Design a protein around this ligand. Structure first.
Ligand SMILES: [Mg+2]
Ligand SMILES: [Mg+2]
Ligand SMILES: [Mg+2]
Ligand SMILES: [Mg+2]
Ligand SMILES: [Mg+2]
Ligand SMILES: [Mg+2]
Ligand SMILES: [Mg+2]
Ligand SMILES: [Mg+2]
Ligand SMILES: [Mg+2]
Ligand SMILES: [Mg+2]
Ligand SMILES: [Mg+2]
Ligand SMILES: [Mg+2]
Ligand SMILES: [Mg+2]
Ligand SMILES: [Mg+2]
Ligand SMILES: [Mg+2]
Ligand SMILES: [Mg+2]
Ligand SMILES: [Mg+2]
Ligand SMILES: [Mg+2]
Ligand SMILES: [Mg+2]
Ligand SMILES: [Mg+2]
Ligand SMILES: [Mg+2]
Ligand SMILES: [Mg+2]
Ligand SMILES: [Mg+2]
Ligand SMILES: [Mg+2]
Ligand SMILES: [Mg+2]
Ligand SMILES: [Mg+2]
Ligand SMILES: [Mg+2]
Ligand SMILES: [Mg+2]
Ligand SMILES: [Mg+2]
Ligand SMILES: [Mg+2]
Ligand SMILES: [Mg+2]
Ligand SMILES: [Mg+2]
Ligand SMILES: [Mg+2]
Ligand SMILES: [Mg+2]
Ligand SMILES: [Mg+2]
Ligand SMILES: [Mg+2]
Ligand SMILES: [Mg+2]
Ligand SMILES: [Mg+2]
Ligand SMILES: [Mg+2]
Ligand SMILES: [Mg+2]
Ligand SMILES: [Mg+2]
Ligand SMILES: [Mg+2]
Ligand SMILES: [Mg+2]
Ligand SMILES: [Mg+2]
Ligand SMILES: [Mg+2]
Ligand SMILES: [Mg+2]
Ligand SMILES: [Mg+2]
Ligand SMILES: [Mg+2]
Ligand SMILES: [Mg+2]
Ligand SMILES: [Mg+2]
Ligand SMILES: [Mg+2]
Ligand SMILES: [Mg+2]
Ligand SMILES: [Mg+2]
Ligand SMILES: [Mg+2]
Ligand SMILES: [Mg+2]
Ligand SMILES: [Mg+2]
Ligand SMILES: [Mg+2]
Ligand SMILES: [Mg+2]
Ligand SMILES: [Mg+2]
Ligand SMILES: [Mg+2]
Ligand SMILES: [Mg+2]
Ligand SMILES: [Mg+2]
Ligand SMILES: [Mg+2]
Ligand SMILES: [Mg+2]
Ligand SMILES: [Mg+2]
Ligand SMILES: [Mg+2]
Ligand SMILES: [Mg+2]
Ligand SMILES: [Mg+2]
Ligand SMILES: [Mg+2]
Ligand SMILES: [Mg+2]
Ligand SMILES: [Mg+2]
Ligand SMILES: [Mg+2]
Ligand SMILES: [Mg+2]
Ligand SMILES: [Mg+2]
Ligand SMILES: [Mg+2]
Ligand SMILES: [Mg+2]
Ligand SMILES: [Mg+2]
Ligand SMILES: [Mg+2]
Ligand SMILES: [Mg+2]
Ligand SMILES: [Mg+2]
Ligand SMILES: [Mg+2]
Ligand SMILES: [Mg+2]
Ligand SMILES: [Mg+2]
Ligand SMILES: [Mg+2]
Ligand SMILES: [Mg+2]
Ligand SMILES: [Mg+2]
Ligand SMILES: [Mg+2]
Ligand SMILES: [Mg+2]
Ligand SMILES: [Mg+2]
Ligand SMILES: [Mg+2]
Ligand SMILES: [Mg+2]
Ligand SMILES: [Mg+2]
Ligand SMILES: [Mg+2]
Ligand SMILES: [Mg+2]
Ligand SMILES: [Mg+2]
Ligand SMILES: [Mg+2]
Ligand SMILES: [Mg+2]
Ligand SMILES: [Mg+2]
Ligand SMILES: [Mg+2]
Ligand SMILES: [Mg+2]
Ligand SMILES: [Mg+2]
Ligand SMILES: [Mg+2]
Ligand SMILES: [Mg+2]
Ligand SMILES: [Mg+2]
Ligand SMILES: [Mg+2]
Ligand SMILES: [Mg+2]
Ligand SMILES: [Mg+2]
Ligand SMILES: [Mg+2]
Ligand SMILES: [Mg+2]
Ligand SMILES: [Mg+2]
Ligand SMILES: [Mg+2]
Ligand SMILES: [Mg+2]
Ligand SMILES: [Mg+2]
Ligand SMILES: [Mg+2]
Ligand SMILES: [Mg+2]
Ligand SMILES: [Mg+2]
Ligand SMILES: [Mg+2]
Ligand SMILES: [Mg+2]
Ligand SMILES: [Mg+2]
Ligand SMILES: [Mg+2]
Ligand SMILES: [Mg+2]
Ligand SMILES: [Mg+2]
Ligand SMILES: [Mg+2]
Ligand SMILES: [Mg+2]
Ligand SMILES: [Mg+2]
Ligand SMILES: [Mg+2]
Ligand SMILES: [Mg+2]
Ligand SMILES: [Mg+2]
Ligand SMILES: [Mg+2]
Ligand SMILES: [Mg+2]
Ligand SMILES: [Mg+2]
Ligand SMILES: [Mg+2]
Ligand SMILES: [Mg+2]
Ligand SMILES: [Mg+2]
Ligand SMILES: [Mg+2]
Ligand SMILES: [Mg+2]
Ligand SMILES: [Mg+2]
Ligand SMILES: [Mg+2]
Ligand SMILES: [Mg+2]
Ligand SMILES: [Mg+2]
Ligand SMILES: [Mg+2]
Ligand SMILES: [Mg+2]
Ligand SMILES: [Mg+2]
Ligand SMILES: [Mg+2]
Ligand SMILES: [Mg+2]
Ligand SMILES: [Mg+2]
Ligand SMILES: [Mg+2]
Ligand SMILES: [Mg+2]
Ligand SMILES: [Mg+2]
Ligand SMILES: [Mg+2]
Ligand SMILES: [Mg+2]
Ligand SMILES: [Mg+2]
Ligand SMILES: [Mg+2]
Ligand SMILES: [Mg+2]
Ligand SMILES: [Mg+2]
Ligand SMILES: [Mg+2]
Ligand SMILES: [Mg+2]
Ligand SMILES: [Mg+2]
Ligand SMILES: [Mg+2]
Ligand SMILES: [Mg+2]
Ligand SMILES: [Mg+2]
Ligand SMILES: [Mg+2]
Ligand SMILES: [Mg+2]
Ligand SMILES: [Mg+2]
Ligand SMILES: [Mg+2]
Ligand SMILES: [Mg+2]
Ligand SMILES: [Mg+2]
Ligand SMILES: [Mg+2]
Ligand SMILES: [Mg+2]
Ligand SMILES: [Mg+2]
Ligand SMILES: [Mg+2]
Ligand SMILES: [Mg+2]
Ligand SMILES: [Mg+2]
Ligand SMILES: [Mg+2]
Ligand SMILES: [Mg+2]
Ligand SMILES: [Mg+2]
Ligand SMILES: [Mg+2]
Ligand SMILES: [Mg+2]
Ligand SMILES: [Mg+2]
Ligand SMILES: [Mg+2]
Ligand SMILES: [Mg+2]
Ligand SMILES: [Mg+2]
Ligand SMILES: [Mg+2]
Ligand SMILES: [Mg+2]
Ligand SMILES: [Mg+2]
Ligand SMILES: [Mg+2]
Ligand SMILES: [Mg+2]
Ligand SMILES: [Mg+2]
Ligand SMILES: [Mg+2]
Ligand SMILES: [Mg+2]
Ligand SMILES: [Mg+2]
Ligand SMILES: [Mg+2]
Ligand SMILES: [Mg+2]
Ligand SMILES: [Mg+2]
Ligand SMILES: [Mg+2]
Ligand SMILES: [Mg+2]
Ligand SMILES: [Mg+2]
Ligand SMILES: [Mg+2]
Ligand SMILES: [Mg+2]
Ligand SMILES: [Mg+2]
Ligand SMILES: [Mg+2]
Ligand SMILES: [Mg+2]
Ligand SMILES: [Mg+2]
Ligand SMILES: [Mg+2]
Ligand SMILES: [Mg+2]
Ligand SMILES: [Mg+2]
Ligand SMILES: [Mg+2]
Ligand SMILES: [Zn+2]
Lengths: 138, 99, 151, 122, 208
RNA sequence: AAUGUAAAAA
RNA sequence: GAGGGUAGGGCCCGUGACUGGGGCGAAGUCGUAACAAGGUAGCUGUACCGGAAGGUGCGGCUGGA
RNA sequence: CUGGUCCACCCGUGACGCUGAGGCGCGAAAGCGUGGGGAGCAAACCGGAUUAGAUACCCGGGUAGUCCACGCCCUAAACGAUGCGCGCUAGGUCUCUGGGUCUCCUGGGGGCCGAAGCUAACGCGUUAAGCGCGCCGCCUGGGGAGUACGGCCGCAAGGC
RNA sequence: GGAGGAAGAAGCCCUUCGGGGUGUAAACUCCUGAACCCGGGACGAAACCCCCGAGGAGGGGACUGACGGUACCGGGGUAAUAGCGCCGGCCAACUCCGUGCCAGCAGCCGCGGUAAUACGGAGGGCGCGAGCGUUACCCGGAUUCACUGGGCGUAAAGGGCGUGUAGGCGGCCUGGGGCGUCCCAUGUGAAAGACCACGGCUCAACCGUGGGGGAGCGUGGGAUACGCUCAGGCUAGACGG
RNA sequence: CAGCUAGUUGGUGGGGUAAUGGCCCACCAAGGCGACGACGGGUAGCCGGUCUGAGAGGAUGGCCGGCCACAGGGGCACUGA
């Protein structure tokens, strides 16, 4: 039945990055888009694009990574080190603009839904709106 | 203002009177989650025009009786047993609690 | 050549017919009080030899640390299996406020303002290892945009 | 647990409990000595301690330690109770107070007289 | 009351010169000069590795004996600076240095902070004219501190001011030995002060 | 093919 | 109608000959069940039984080979 | 007579889903009731032997029970000591079962070794103890104790 | 009390019997002058009241101070109370004698059974000082009830197993409503208090004035992405042939 | 502590009151409340605030200010805005 399509997507990306895939797909959905769109615009992913598995709308999400490392375990540093859903289905989180979180002292982002649209933490303050704190990413 | 609420008549087994059940959601004071609670008000129906299942607005009002301090404002929709069931099954399962 | 400071020198032991002999733990930190830092844990049947040995390992394993006026860039939480440690940025005049271990680290790190706490376990050793990693995961604004670029 | 489980059952409060029924949780309680006696210590030590069973204002009847060297308590000494157990002695949750009522101070103590009710030597 | 009991025994406990004496501490014996090691029966014995506490402790105890001031008062001031916006560490010093009895010393009116206290206390000093016998009096920037009338002609005041010729002092201060007065020009920058101590270590001490 | 109390580790 | 009186129940506390087990106690009597195939692998639900640990039966588990 | 489950076709419904306090049903063995049955085995019980003793291990004997019907009891190392549902995250090999022209593939099951990762370690690892969300159950120092009081259930033993 | 004040009195403790310590500490020297003393001596009090102006507006006049001869100012003026906790580890502070599982200590770990930095006294030291310690209780540490911020194979913890009521949670597309939610506007959120600034009493505590924000609820307006909700469509879930 | 309830829930009319009201009364109808914790027991005046705490939280209500309650225990009404 799949509980939270969002947490899923976020997770799909986390599970994929760790193994360094080039792109994991995800079941398509308008609201899901924005998350990517922003997530990409800020520089967390090379990009995304609609696709189709055996007659099912999905989304390719081309992952970004750091350069190779020297020494034991040439594991390439991540571009997404951290990603986590805040407002869950079993606990909706809502914040006023006068109280929106600063992810990793500004290094990080905090995407969130709002009456004006899905916006970054900063863009939230920009247009001065609060909303459902979706998740943060750094 | 005379704050108005909205709920379904769950009882009409009374003269010129009806019982109205209304829920109200809200964020929990410590864990956020949008819990919901309800309450029964006794509404003054002078015509006995509002039967069971009717969803209705009811207004804060002059005392009518010990518990009647709300009048029936207007109809909202008729067929609504689905709700009446909820509250009635609730009463049911009480049988299966005592000892 | 840098600075030198040991966190502890414990005497471990081992059984063997007829008695017990002991090696000697010795954890030491070393730094220039200016970004370059390195931790070391030496062992040997001699206290001096042990600290000496920790000295060699210290300068071996090292780590540059992005210092913003004596504080750390962003806050980070790092759990070394057992224990866990928090690290927070603070304005000048705050001082290094932490358990004796992470102090040695951050002090010889050249850090001078920082809020911190040891949650979870607290074994000096593991908290040591933990902090090193934590700093080793600090990233300057550049590092960020530099990775988040990929031009 | 889930959040919801919390929203139901919820978090049980610690609720601690006392170590001294000096009653009214007062700072001290008066009483009369019922019996002045000397008792052997516990598991790892030994040395007959100076103790007395006191009847409380609070209708009780507790055993209490007489600190210091030598004392003057007898089967009718009124005295002040202080509370503080003793690792060495089985069930003894109170100290007597030297230097109040019929309980003298420690004779000739020069160091830390405050804890042994002893006046300042000239 | 202040520390009354022996002074030159602390010059000796901290191991750093403590200038809470007169001519003597500059003489060839701050007491410390003849014995560079702690008081008591031991003093010259194999010194032990100090606990982080011991170290942090010494530092604060050092800084306090310097200004010669009640622990209570000392702490409160620390807190007072912790409140206000500003580099807590240095600011603390600023409040310390801002005390009247301090000013008087810095300004050469007296040879000793302790002595200076007795001068303020016995009312020989005056701020902006109205006499002030309060050592703790926080001298704000722009106050004219000087010697009072019946006071001006006193031996001690004389000799001190006499010897106060030339010898420049404190960028945040300005003397006038002619008229026996000076000015708290401004609040002293950290650098102006040159204490043998370290504010940070004290900051730390007060986390415990 | 039973059992050996009770004061030893900077 | 305060309150008194009468009768009958409910909860809670204190107290009681004696009695059940429990905790603690540098040393006692009995044996040695367990910890190594602990010298019959142990452990377990249960049932009988025996000064005491226990034993045995049925099944079950390896935290046994 | 009947329950579950798996595979092929992509034909029908159209979010009808997931979890689940209480409730209800099932629930090894031993045990209880009434009636039956009884070969072998075997608590208790007796005799032999061993031993300081031996109510035990070993041997000879031996009743309830073990078997059936109907009813009751409801506990366990009821153990993978791991609640269920869904999505995601390298492969290697063994085996049970289905579909496909097939040294191969595709599904559902049972095992071992292992990516990444998790773990206090042992270890786990697409049958997760990894990464995530939903829902329930449970924990919060050792002893006293699964004891006591109360309540409920039970013929009883006794259970919750 | 302030400055000076010996290669450093006596006394006392330690010692490898040379010496080391208390220690600039004292004495002593000069200076200053709490207390005490004499003279002065408040603010807090202008109004009600009376005169003119009408008895009003406005102007004008006078009476009353409990604290108190106190605060404070002026002059004179004597070197003028120091105590308590601790010094095994946490925990800053070490030696000596006495003692001998005794006398005793104790917050945790533990310490004392002839040689104790752990008992008790001494010398010395660390900490604070008109205080210092103790007992009692609250919050802290305790992310040890965990919302922030924990867990459950073996450490304490998955229910014996299933069916299922209530509740909780709910896939993809579009539309209306706008409950939740976000925004703005206004009402309210007394004073006192908290924080900031500046002023008053010699400082300070205490006090005055001014400033700011505040969760929360009431009214109005607005946004509609996520949640909800009515409505419409789909087939990836689930079910069915 | 798991069920509670006869002025009990509602109505009609009536008393009473500054006034609404089972507040009290006559008749009528059978209702009202409860796992979202009724009914029962134990405790307690409540807030502005105070204390601690990184905070979220916890604890707490002395003095000052606000409201409530009482005036040896209990009941009653009289005068009156
Ligand atoms: Mg790659
Ligand atoms: Mg960009
Ligand atoms: Mg009707
Ligand atoms: Mg709200
Ligand atoms: Mg009952
Ligand atoms: Mg160098
Ligand atoms: Mg260098
Ligand atoms: Mg060195
Ligand atoms: Mg290594
Ligand atoms: Mg080497
Ligand atoms: Mg670099
Ligand atoms: Mg760097
Ligand atoms: Mg962990
Ligand atoms: Mg520990
Ligand atoms: Mg430990
Ligand atoms: Mg780096
Ligand atoms: Mg770098
Ligand atoms: Mg004994
Ligand atoms: Mg005696
Ligand atoms: Mg006697
Ligand atoms: Mg005497
Ligand atoms: Mg003592
Ligand atoms: Mg601060
Ligand atoms: Mg502050
Ligand atoms: Mg700052
Ligand atoms: Mg500051
Ligand atoms: Mg100058
Ligand atoms: Mg603090
Ligand atoms: Mg024996
Ligand atoms: Mg024996
Ligand atoms: Mg033994
Ligand atoms: Mg009566
Ligand atoms: Mg009666
Ligand atoms: Mg009576
Ligand atoms: Mg009769
Ligand atoms: Mg009775
Ligand atoms: Mg009784
Ligand atoms: Mg008994
Ligand atoms: Mg028993
Ligand atoms: Mg017994
Ligand atoms: Mg008994
Ligand atoms: Mg027992
Ligand atoms: Mg015994
Ligand atoms: Mg005997
Ligand atoms: Mg025995
Ligand atoms: Mg024996
Ligand atoms: Mg045995
Ligand atoms: Mg045997
Ligand atoms: Mg065995
Ligand atoms: Mg058995
Ligand atoms: Mg017998
Ligand atoms: Mg068996
Ligand atoms: Mg089985
Ligand atoms: Mg085993
Ligand atoms: Mg074998
Ligand atoms: Mg079949
Ligand atoms: Mg067809
Ligand atoms: Mg269709
Ligand atoms: Mg739906
Ligand atoms: Mg059964
Ligand atoms: Mg059977
Ligand atoms: Mg039987
Ligand atoms: Mg039978
Ligand atoms: Mg029978
Ligand atoms: Mg019969
Ligand atoms: Mg039979
Ligand atoms: Mg037979
Ligand atoms: Mg046989
Ligand atoms: Mg037998
Ligand atoms: Mg036999
Ligand atoms: Mg014989
Ligand atoms: Mg025999
Ligand atoms: Mg046999
Ligand atoms: Mg048969
Ligand atoms: Mg048959
Ligand atoms: Mg039959
Ligand atoms: Mg379950
Ligand atoms: Mg199912
Ligand atoms: Mg096949
Ligand atoms: Mg094919
Ligand atoms: Mg083919
Ligand atoms: Mg096919
Ligand atoms: Mg073939
Ligand atoms: Mg093959
Ligand atoms: Mg293949
Ligand atoms: Mg196959
Ligand atoms: Mg398989
Ligand atoms: Mg397979
Ligand atoms: Mg494996
Ligand atoms: Mg690996
Ligand atoms: Mg799979
Ligand atoms: Mg899969
Ligand atoms: Mg596999
Ligand atoms: Mg799975
Ligand atoms: Mg795991
Ligand atoms: Mg695990
Ligand atoms: Mg417990
Ligand atoms: Mg306990
Ligand atoms: Mg317990
Ligand atoms: Mg138990
Ligand atoms: Mg227990
Ligand atoms: Mg049992
Ligand atoms: Mg029982
Ligand atoms: Mg009971
Ligand atoms: Mg009882
Ligand atoms: Mg019972
Ligand atoms: Mg019965
Ligand atoms: Mg029977
Ligand atoms: Mg059970
Ligand atoms: Mg002097
Ligand atoms: Mg000397
Ligand atoms: Mg000498
Ligand atoms: Mg002279
Ligand atoms: Mg003179
Ligand atoms: Mg006097
Ligand atoms: Mg006058
Ligand atoms: Mg006047
Ligand atoms: Mg006046
Ligand atoms: Mg006047
Ligand atoms: Mg008059
Ligand atoms: Mg006139
Ligand atoms: Mg006139
Ligand atoms: Mg006039
Ligand atoms: Mg006038
Ligand atoms: Mg006038
Ligand atoms: Mg007077
Ligand atoms: Mg006077
Ligand atoms: Mg006079
Ligand atoms: Mg006069
Ligand atoms: Mg006078
Ligand atoms: Mg006077
Ligand atoms: Mg005058
Ligand atoms: Mg005067
Ligand atoms: Mg004078
Ligand atoms: Mg004198
Ligand atoms: Mg003198
Ligand atoms: Mg102390
Ligand atoms: Mg301390
Ligand atoms: Mg020390
Ligand atoms: Mg003796
Ligand atoms: Mg002797
Ligand atoms: Mg000795
Ligand atoms: Mg000894
Ligand atoms: Mg001690
Ligand atoms: Mg001692
Ligand atoms: Mg002394
Ligand atoms: Mg004072
Ligand atoms: Mg606490
Ligand atoms: Mg606590
Ligand atoms: Mg807490
Ligand atoms: Mg835990
Ligand atoms: Mg789990
Ligand atoms: Mg327990
Ligand atoms: Mg289940
Ligand atoms: Mg179940
Ligand atoms: Mg179990
Ligand atoms: Mg059960
Ligand atoms: Mg189910
Ligand atoms: Mg449902
Ligand atoms: Mg939805
Ligand atoms: Mg729903
Ligand atoms: Mg929906
Ligand atoms: Mg919609
Ligand atoms: Mg609406
Ligand atoms: Mg607003
Ligand atoms: Mg407020
Ligand atoms: Mg407002
Ligand atoms: Mg306002
Ligand atoms: Mg206010
Ligand atoms: Mg506060
Ligand atoms: Mg102003
Ligand atoms: Mg001022
Ligand atoms: Mg004055
Ligand atoms: Mg104000
Ligand atoms: Mg204000
Ligand atoms: Mg506020
Ligand atoms: Mg506001
Ligand atoms: Mg609201
Ligand atoms: Mg819409
Ligand atoms: Mg429809
Ligand atoms: Mg639909
Ligand atoms: Mg399908
Ligand atoms: Mg009736
Ligand atoms: Mg009426
Ligand atoms: Mg009236
Ligand atoms: Mg009534
Ligand atoms: Mg009526
Ligand atoms: Mg009636
Ligand atoms: Mg109640
Ligand atoms: Mg309270
Ligand atoms: Mg408030
Ligand atoms: Mg409050
Ligand atoms: Mg509050
Ligand atoms: Mg605070
Ligand atoms: Mg609070
Ligand atoms: Mg708390
Ligand atoms: Mg009050
Ligand atoms: Mg109170
Ligand atoms: Mg009072
Ligand atoms: Mg009063
Ligand atoms: Mg009072
Ligand atoms: Mg009040
Ligand atoms: Mg009100
Ligand atoms: Mg009364
Ligand atoms: Mg009365
Ligand atoms: Mg009275
Ligand atoms: Mg009366
Ligand atoms: Zn000196």
């Amino acid at each position: 039945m799949l509980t939270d399509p969002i947490a899923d997507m976020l997770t799909r990306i986390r599970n994929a990055t760790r193994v360094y895939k080039e792109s994991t797909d995800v079941p398509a959905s308008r609201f899901k888009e924005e998350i990517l769109r922003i997530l990409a615009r800020e520089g967390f992913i090379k990009g995304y694009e609609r696709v189709d598995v055996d007659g099912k709308p999905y989304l390719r999400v081309y992952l970004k990574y750091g350069p190779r490392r020297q020494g034991p375990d040439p594991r390439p540093e991540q571009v997404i080190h951290h990603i986590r859903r805040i407002s869950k289905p079993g606990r909706r989180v809502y914040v006023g603009v006068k109280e929106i979180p600063r992810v990793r002292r500004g290094l990080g982002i905090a995407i969130l839904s709002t009456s004006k649209g899905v916006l970054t933490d900063r863009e939230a303050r920009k247009l001065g709106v609060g909303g459902e704190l979706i998740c943060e990413v750094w | 203002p005379k704050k108005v609420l909205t709920g379904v008549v769950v009882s009409d087994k009374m003269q010129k009177t009806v019982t109205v059940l209304v829920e109200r959601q809200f964020p929990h004071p410590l864990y956020g989650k949008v819990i919901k609670r309800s309450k029964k008000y006794l509404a003054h129906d002078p015509e006995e025009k509002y039967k069971l299942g009717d969803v209705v607005e009811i207004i804060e009002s002059r005392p009518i009786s010990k518990r009647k301090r709300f009048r029936v404002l207007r109809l909202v929709e008729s067929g609504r047993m689905d709700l009446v069931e909820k509250y009635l099954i609730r009463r049911q399962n009480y049988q299966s609690l005592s000892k | 050549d840098f600075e030198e400071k040991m966190i502890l020198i414990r005497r471990t032991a081992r059984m063997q017919a007829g008695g017990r002999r002991f090696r000697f733990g010795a954890l030491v930190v070393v730094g220039d009080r200016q970004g370059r830092v390195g931790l070391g844990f030496g062992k040997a049947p001699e206290v001096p030899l042990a600290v000496q040995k920790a000295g060699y390992y210290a300068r071996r394993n090292m780590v540059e640390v992005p210092l913003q006026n004596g504080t750390i860039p962003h806050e980070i939480e790092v759990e070394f299996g057992a224990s866990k440690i928090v690290l927070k940025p603070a304005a000048p005049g705050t001082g290094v406020i932490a358990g004796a271990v992470p102090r040695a680290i951050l002090e010889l790190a050249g850090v001078t303002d920082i809020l911190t706490k040891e949650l979870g376990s607290r074994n000096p050793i593991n908290i040591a290892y933990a902090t090193m990693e934590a700093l080793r995961q600090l990233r300057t604004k550049a590092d960020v945009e530099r990775l988040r670029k990929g031009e | 647990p889930t959040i919801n489980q919390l929203v139901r059952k919820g978090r049980e409060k610690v609720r601690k409990k006392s170590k001294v029924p000096a009653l009214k949780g007062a700072p001290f309680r008066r009483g009369v000595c019922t019996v002045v006696r000397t008792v052997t210590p516990k598991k790892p030590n030994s040395a007959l301690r100076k103790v007395a069973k006191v009847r409380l204002t609070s209708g009780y009847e507790v055993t209490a330690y007489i600190p210091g060297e030598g004392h003057n308590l007898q089967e009718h000494s009124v005295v002040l109770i202080r509370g503080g157990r003793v690792k060495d002695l089985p069930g003894v949750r109170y100290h007597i107070v030297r230097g109040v009522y019929d309980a003298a101070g420690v004779k000739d103590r020069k160091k830390s007289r405050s804890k042994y009710g002893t006046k300042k030597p000239k | 009351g202040r520390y009354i009991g022996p002074v030159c025994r602390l010059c000796r406990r901290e191991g750093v010169k403590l200038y809470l004496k007169g001519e003597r501490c500059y003489s060839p014996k701050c007491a410390m000069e003849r014995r560079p090691y702690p008081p008591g029966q031991h003093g010259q014995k194999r010194a032990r590795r100090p606990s982080d506490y011991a170290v942090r402790l010494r530092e604060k105890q050092k800084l306090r004996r310097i200004y010669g001031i009640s622990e209570r008062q000392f702490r409160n001031l620390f807190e007072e600076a912790s409140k206000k916006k500003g580099v807590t560490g240095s600011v603390f010093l600023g409040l310390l240095e801002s005390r009247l009895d301090n000013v008087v010393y810095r300004l050469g009116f007296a040879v000793s902070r302790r002595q200076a206290r007795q001068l303020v206390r016995h009312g020989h000093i005056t701020v902006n004219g109205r006499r002030v016998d309060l050592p703790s009096y926080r001298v704000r920037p722009g106050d004219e501190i000087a010697v009072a009338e019946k006071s001006r002609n006193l031996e001690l005041i004389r000799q001190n001011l006499e010897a106060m010729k030339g010898r420049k002092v404190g960028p945040w201060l300005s003397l006038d030995v002619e008229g026996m007065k000076g000015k708290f020009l401004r609040l002293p920058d950290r650098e102006d002060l040159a204490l043998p101590v370290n504010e940070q270590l004290v900051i730390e001490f007060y986390s415990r």
